[PDB]
Every structure is written in C-alpha cells, then in structure tokens.
Amino acid sequence: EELREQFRVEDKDGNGYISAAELRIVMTNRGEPLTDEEVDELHRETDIDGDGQVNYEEFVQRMTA
Amino acid sequence: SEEELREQFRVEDKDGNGYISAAELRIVMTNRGEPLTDEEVDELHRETDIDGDGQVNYEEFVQRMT
Ligand SMILES: [Ca+2]
Ligand SMILES: [Ca+2]
Ligand SMILES: [Ca+2]
Ligand SMILES: [Ca+2]
Ligand SMILES: [Ca+2]
C-alpha cells in the first residue's frame, strides 16, 4: 500500500529500519533544512520502542498523525 | 579497559538506545567545556560513524577510542 511503498523508499539499505542517516536523507529531500543534530531528536521521537531504529510500525504511527 | 569504555559509552548514550547521536556528542562536548562548534561536533561524529547509518554504536565508539 502507499505507506509500505514510502517506507521502502526511505529504507535505503533495505534492512527494515530507518536510521538517523536515512531520516536525514528524507528531510533533505522534503526540502526541510534541518541540522544533523535536529534530525537526531526527530529520529529519537519516532523510535517508540527505543532500540535506536525506526521500524515500519513506528513509521506508520508517525504517519497517522 | 572494557569497564572504562562501557562507562564512557553509557555517559554519552544519554537516551539509552545503544547508539551515540551527533546531538548526544554535542551535549558531551558542551558538558566538558570542549570549544567545538556544532559543525565540528558533527564532523567528529561522521568520522566515528564507520557504517554510515548516522549512529555511533559501541563497536564504532571503541574503534575510535582505541
Ligand atoms: Ca528501499
Ligand atoms: Ca535502513
Ligand atoms: Ca524502534
Ligand atoms: Ca543514544
Ligand atoms: Ca554507525
């Protein structure tokens, strides 16, 4: 579905997680100038279970906002 | 030693997710009074981040420190 496809676009190495670096790429491509350190905090906020990675369920939870 | 490296990793990994972010390294350097700009902090972090995921794990921390 559309959420699955968007997750796949943001997951560059295809390991099922969106990393901080992959989130930086997302924000760059959205034309949102964010510093690396700011993206770090956005990544942390998205990482509900605190394993340091954004999985698909966490991506969906944020996209539902 | 492993015990000292683990202690230092835990100090830097404030949010406890198993990684040190550039934002966490910024906090580390400011708390130490290290005269580094944000760009310099972010550059050090990029140099430490061997695998490029934007996140410094314990292995990469040890590699930089040893
Ligand atoms: Ca992909
Ligand atoms: Ca990935
Ligand atoms: Ca997670
Ligand atoms: Ca951390
Ligand atoms: Ca890394």
> Per CATH, which fold does B2-65 belong to?
Recoverin; domain 1 (1.10.238)
Q: Are B45 and B12 in contact (CB under 8 A)?
A: no
**Determined by which method?**
X-ray
Q: Which residues, at least 6 apart from A16, have a Cβ–Cβ distance to it below 8 Å?
A: A55, A56
The pairs formed by A5-14 with CB atoms below 8 angstroms and a separation of 24 or more are A6/A59, A6/A63, A7/A56, A7/A59, A10/A59
Q: How far is the CA of A32 from the centre of ligand 4 (A)?
A: 23
Of A10, A25, A43, A39, nearest in space to B42 by CA = A39
**Residue position matching structure tokens 């496809």:** A5
Distance CA B46, CA B66 (A): 17
Distance CA A33, CA A35 (A): 7
Evaluated on CA atoms B36, B38, B43, B48, the torsion sign reads positive
- Chain A residues whose CB is inside 8 A of the B24 CB are 40
Asked whether the beta carbons of residue A40 and residue B23 sit closer than 8 angstroms, the reply is: yes
Q: How far is the CA of A23 from the centre of ligand 1 (A)?
A: 13
> Per CATH, which fold does A2-63 belong to?
Recoverin; domain 1 (1.10.238)
Q: Which phi and psi angles does B38 have, rounded to 5°?
A: -55, -40
- Chain A residues whose CB is inside 8 A of the B15 CB are 44, 50
DSSP code at position A30: T
Q: Are B9 and B61 in contact (CB under 8 A)?
A: yes
* Among chain B residues, CA nearest to A42: B23
- Structure-token pair, residue A55: 């999985």
